[PDB]
Amino acid sequence: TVAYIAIGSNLASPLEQVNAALKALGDIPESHILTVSSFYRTPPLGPQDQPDYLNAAVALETSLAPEELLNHTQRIELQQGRVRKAERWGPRTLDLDIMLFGNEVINTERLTVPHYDMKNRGFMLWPLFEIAPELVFPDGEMLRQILHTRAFDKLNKW
Ligand SMILES: Nc1ncnc2c1ncn2[C@@H]1O[C@H](COP(=O)(O)CP(=O)(O)OP(=O)(O)O)[C@@H](O)[C@H]1O
Ligand SMILES: Nc1nc2ncc(C(=O)O)nc2c(=O)[nH]1
Ligand SMILES: [Cl-]
Ligand SMILES: [Cl-]
Ligand SMILES: [Cl-]
Ligand SMILES: [Mg+2]
């Protein structure tokens, strides 16, 4: 199945963090990278007392179960010094979010796929569209059409 993973970083040299994350994603068992986006510099969604993010997206072919993929993406975050602060939307060295896991709909305590907020976030959708312009969501909506409807600002390269 093709998993689409969003990458964000706004601490500890985001470019280095993102390059390290891409290497580590390729090292996940039973999986391989298919496509990587460009790197974008985006202003924080939430609290404004934090740096700009580097955002990107990757397509990862995998035969792991979704929770097993999540175990690995969380391991990569931890090995890159991710610390969850108290505040919501606060800064982090690395955030790996599973946007889509094929055409699956997953609703569990640990894992909600499609990612619950991605359709509201240009920093998620634009890198995704770069790597998967024909994508159709589980609910039948075209990615291309969502971008048009919402008319989110285009992103700047890192
Ligand atoms: N699609 C998904 N991808 C990654 N984690 C997910 C997820 N759906 C649910 N989660 C859960 O989200 C929990 C918190 O992860 P965090 O990375 O701290 C949220 P965040 O990415 O900072 O905010 P965001 O989800 O608004 O982007 C994880 O422990 C995981 O169980
Ligand atoms: N610009 C930007 N802001 C963000 N703000 C919050 C979160 C998050 O809570 O995971 N992620 C991002 C992100 O990746 N990019
Ligand atoms: Cl605010
Ligand atoms: Cl949802
Ligand atoms: Cl959907
Ligand atoms: Mg996130």
Ligand SMILES: [Mg+2]
């Ligand atoms: Mg996350």
